[PDB]
Structure formats: structure tokens, C-alpha cells
């Protein structure tokens, strides 16, 4: 159930260029005879993609990252690749996503799985039901913390006569999948051309994903030795992995509504021109398409090299306070203070700021700060605000309408109350 598989055939990883591949309908909207520019996680054109082989005993199924998305394409003839795995650590300590395809059905689970190294689906014969079953317990040992399950029609359906391209995304709480099946006769690498991927599902798993791995099948028909890193043979099935990035594309639409072409605006200045003019044809001439701007490299922070702390302690933790009609004023100057600690302290029942927030207050310099302190009762606390009316705001302490500061209050019944 958890056997290893450690055949040792080392070959360096190959790379290929994705000429124009990975385009998908960004929304479920119909468009015809129109050029549309949209920004979304796409596979840049002529992108440097890795290449992995599974031909004989060379097997390539490492754990790869899932930075922002994946363009997964597979040239197959025997449906050797059955599905994928997604997660952070792929062990029982964290939740992980699983996608596998049974004949004429799909299994999707979000459990805390404990995958063994070099997993795979096993195929055998059962001698009852008279049919070669496909038990999936080689992939994972245990399944804890299951929250989600889902079944649907096959995602993958039938040298390489067919091409299956997939697009995976992990947007805020939805795992989005775009797919396309294109038949081709090329056997070496990706066929240069164009084909858009239509959306398939949007799973609301709501988890954190950083790594992913692929699932393949093995053939052990001609003979079967004991379970070990041997006795397995993999047919010719290869797959390519590409990472998506936020990119602005210009999409074309035909009469039918299919894409059939697109343009990556930041590929080259000519693409910038095409996107600027909202056309795939540029007439002879000179066009203004963008603006060159040198960006800063680092920040420069300069302040007077003085060393002193503002005496907020003798203002807040003062032994006695003043009456509101004779409210005391303290002028704070020539010192350094941390308003973050003040805001952190939960001794205060009221902490409303105006024209500036306290979290963005311990990085702004002022010439003078005035600390006015007094004592009022509960229902009068709301009167200490710009544009308020009452006995206190009219006759005792009035705040301007352009006030820039914070109002702090706390219940002092334990200190300012007498039994009589």
C-alpha cells in the first residue's frame, strides 16, 4: 500500500518554448468579432517551460511548486497520466488536494493525506467481477480531516495522437481548472499553433497550496516480480509544466465566438503597439504606446539624530486629572514617541482618530503635539469629536472641524469616584 519506487536513471531536465499556448477564456461571456484586452494570470508567449519524460527505465515525477498557477500539457496515447496532487507538505500534518480518474468517472477529495514517496496508481486483476481493477491505495496511506468530495465525468478522455492541456489556478478560495483536448500527430514536442482552454470546474477548497505532483500509471503485464523498485514499465507519455504570471493579453474573437488568436502586450514593443491600437494589424507610421520611467532602487530615510522619549507616561498615567472646564494642556516637543504601544494598550475604552490612523502614526513627524486631558462622564464621551454639540463641547472643550488627531478615553470609576 505504501511501497517505494526508486529506479535510478538520471537524465537532466529538458526545456522547451511555449510559442502560443495556455490561453483560456477569462470569463463565461460570449464575444464575437471583437478584440478584448484583459489582465489575468496567463502563460507568457515563448515561455521557458520544463520538459519531463516517462519513457524506457526513466521516470520523472518530482514535487514541483505552485507559485501562482500551472499550465500542464500532456502528449499521450494510452492515458498513462491519471491525475495530480496539490498541497504544501503532502503529509498528514496538512490538508492536500487529490484528483484521480477512474474509467468513466473522477474522484476528488480534500483530506489530510499521507503520501508515500513516488506514488502511483496500481492496476491488477481481481479474479472476481472478472475485470482489472484500479485500486488507488498506493498513492496515499491514510485520509484524515476530510472536508470535500466531488465526482464528475472524465477530465482526460481519448505516436501521440491527442493532446491534453490543463490550466490550474488557486484564486482566493476557488481552485479553477481550464482544459482542452486537441488531436495532433507531432511526436517530438509541443505543436506550434493556437488553441484556447475552456473552463471545467471551480472548486471551493479554500486551502493554501505551494507544491504539486503528478500521477501516472505503470504496466506489469508481461511479468510481475515482487513489489519493489523493479518489474514496472512506462509507455511513452511526456508532460510539460509552465508557471503563470499576471499578464495583460489582447484577445481576438471570431464570428462563432472562439478565440483563435491573442497577443501578449508586454512581449515586444510591436505587441505594445497592437494592444494600444486595439488591433492585430498596424498601419505604417509612428505610434505612441507607452511611457518610459526610471524606477527608484532604494528608499532614503533621514531624520535628526536625536535621542529622547516623549513623556506620555506623565500624561496618561498622571495621578490626578483636570476638570473639563479647566482642562489641562501638555505640549509635547523634541522627543520620539511610539503611538503603536499606546494603541496596543487595551486600557482605553475610546480610541477614535481623525484625519490620520494610529497604525500609520508612528512614522510621521510633527512640529508640536498637544495633549489635552480632563474628566467627563460616560454619556458625554461622544461629545469629544469635531462638529458635536452639548454642554461640554459648547461651554467646556470644543474641537475644530479640521481636527487632526486622536481622542482617547477610559473608564476611571475606580479612581475618580468617592463613596459619598
Amino acid at each position: 500500500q505504501c511501497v517505494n519506487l526508486t529506479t535510478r536513471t538520471q537524465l537532466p531536465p529538458a526545456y522547451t518554448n511555449s510559442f502560443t499556448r495556455g490561453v483560456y477564456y477569462p470569463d463565461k461571456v460570449f464575444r464575437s468579432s471583437v478584440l478584448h484586452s484583459t489582465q489575468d494570470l496567463f502563460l507568457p508567449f515563448f515561455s521557458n517551460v520544463t520538459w519531463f519524460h516517462a519513457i524506457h527505465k526513466r521516470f520523472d515525477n518530482p514535487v514541483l511548486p505552485f507559485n501562482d498557477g500551472v499550465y500542464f500539457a500532456s502528449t499521450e496515447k494510452s492515458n498513462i497520466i491519471r491525475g495530480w496532487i496539490f498541497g504544501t507538505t503532502l503529509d498528514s500534518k496538512t490538508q492536500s488536494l487529490l484528483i484521480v480518474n477512474n474509467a468513466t468517472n473522477v474522484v476528488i477529495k480534500v483530506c489530510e493525506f499521507q503520501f508515500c514517496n513516488d506514488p502511483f496508481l496500481g492496476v491488477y486483476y481481481h479474479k472476481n467481477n472478472k475485470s482489472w481493477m484500479e485500486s488507488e491505495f498506493r498513492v496515499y496511506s491514510s485520509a484524515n480531516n476530510c472536508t470535500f468530495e466531488y465526482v464528475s465525468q472524465p477530465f482526460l478522455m481519448d505516436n501521440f495522437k491527442n493532446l491534453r492541456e490543463f490550466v490550474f489556478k488557486n484564486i482566493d478560495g476557488y481552485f479553477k481548472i481550464y482544459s482542452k483536448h486537441t488531436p495532433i500527430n507531432l511526436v517530438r514536442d509541443l505543436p506550434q499553433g493556437f488553441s484556447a482552454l475552456e473552463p471545467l470546474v471551480d472548486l471551493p477548497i479554500g486551502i493554501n497550496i505551494t507544491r504539486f505532483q503528478t500521477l501516472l500509471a505503470l504496466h506489469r503485464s508481461y511479468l510481475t516480480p515482487g513489489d519493489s523498485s523493479s518489474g514496472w514499465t512506462a509507455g511513452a507519455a511526456a508532460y510539460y509544466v509552465g508557471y503563470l504570471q499576471p499578464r495583460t493579453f489582447l484577445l481576438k474573437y471570431n464570428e462563432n465566438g472562439t478565440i483563435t488568436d491573442a497577443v501578449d502586450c508586454a512581449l515586444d514593443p510591436l505587441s505594445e503597439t497592437k494592444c494600444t491600437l486595439k488591433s492585430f494589424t498596424v498601419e505604417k507610421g509612428i505610434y505612441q504606446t507607452s511611457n518610459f520611467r526610471v524606477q527608484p532602487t532604494e528608499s532614503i530615510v533621514r531624520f535628526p539624530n536625536i535621542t529622547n522619549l516623549c513623556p506620555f507616561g506623565e500624561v496618561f498615567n498622571a495621578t490626578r486629572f483636570a476638570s473639563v472646564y479647566a482642562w489641562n494642556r501638555k505640549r509635547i516637543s523634541n522627543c520620539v514617541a511610539d503611538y503603536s504601544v499606546l494603541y496596543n494598550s487595551a486600557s482605553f475604552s475610546t480610541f477614535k482618530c481623525y484625519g490620520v490612523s494610529p497604525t500609520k502614526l508612528n512614522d510621521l513627524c510633527f512640529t508640536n503635539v498637544y495633549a489635552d486631558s480632563f474628566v467627563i462622564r460616560g454619556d458625554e464621551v461622544r461629545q469629544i469629536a469635531p462638529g458635536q454639540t452639548g454642554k461640554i463641547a459648547d461651554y467646556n472643550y470644543k474641537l475644530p472641524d479640521d481636527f487632526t488627531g486622536c481622542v482617547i478615553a477610559w473608564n476611571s470609576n475606580n479612581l475618580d469616584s468617592k463613596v459619598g
Partner: antibody
Amino acid sequence: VQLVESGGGVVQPGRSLRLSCAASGFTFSSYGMHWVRQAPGKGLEWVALISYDGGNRYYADSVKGRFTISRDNSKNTLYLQMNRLRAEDTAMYYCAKDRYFMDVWGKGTTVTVSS
Amino acid sequence: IQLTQSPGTLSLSPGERATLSCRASQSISGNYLAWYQHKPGQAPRLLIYGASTRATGIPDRFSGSGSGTDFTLTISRLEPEDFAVYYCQQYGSSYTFGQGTKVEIK
């Protein structure tokens, strides 16, 4: 990962006794299951094995024709039907999970063949 | 396949080196030879499989060697918990066990 045997006790020679093994904590239907016995103060003696799907069975030469091993994958149980018992079959019978070898062993059921 | 273990009883003290042998009447297929430990009142516990592969949780003082018909289990520095009966097993052609070696304190 836990195996609990049941059905032990005294049985008169010539009569029958059925042992059962209840499994939990693992994918029972994916492992072959063995029976092993140990006479008091003597060594281990393999008795029978049943494949994970119940299609293939094998028995020790000393019990061929008399013992039958079965399993129920829906109820996570393995059974050993012991017919025409002899005094020399008195032993502790262990239920054990295949890993091949056996890596998970039950505590065993004591079977005494006596009048 | 008959497995004959030797010696029948081994008497040693903690800290010493123990060598246990297992001989098969026929060559074992695929080095399918395992070793098991049994303490009184306890079920057996896997120590070694594949003739030389240590089972999970088994300390490195246990090591297995041999091929064909002749196999050895070595315990490099005996600990008190290591005094027990040891059985070898072949699993290449049916499933048969040795008669056991008792490792006792001298």
C-alpha cells in the same frame, strides 16, 4: 493498526471451531492476511494465508484439507474454520497482516483441544 | 523449504556481539528472508526483511546479511531488551519459519 482475535476456547478432539479476526485502523481490503500458531513453549508455525481480495488461499501441509481461511472485506474480518481438530493443534493462534512477511500481529486466541 | 536455525540456545551478556544463523534446505528466492523477535507473552515483531533491510523503528545494532541458503542476523552490542527468541522466515516459496534461537543472559 489493530487486530483482535476471537473464538478461542476448549474443543473436543474431532470437533470444529471457527476463529475470527476483527481489523480496524488500516485499509483492510488491500492487505493479504495470514494465520500463525504457536504451541506452548514451541516455535512459530505458519497455518494459512488469504490474499487481499480473497481469490487465492494457501495452507500449511499439516492442516491441508481440515482448515479453511476466509475474509469479509465489507466487515473487516478474517475467519479461520478449523475442522477435525487434533490434540496437536492446541496452540495460540495469531492473526497477522501481510506487509510477504507479517508486520502487524494480533494478540492471539488460545485454542485448547481436549476432552 | 525447511529452515534450520543454529545455535539452539545462545548465552551472552549485555554489550557483547551475537551472531545468529539460518540455513534453508533450498535456495531462497529474491532474498526473501525475514527475522522476527518474540518475547514471552508477546506477539512476534518484525526486525529485518529483504535479508538486509531494517524494519521501521528497529535500532541500527541489528543487521542482516547472507544470500542463497545461508543467512546471518548480527546484533552488534546486545542490550537487555534484546534477550528473546529469534525466528527466521522465508517468503519466496510458501511461508515457513525456523524453529527459533533463544538468546538468554549468561
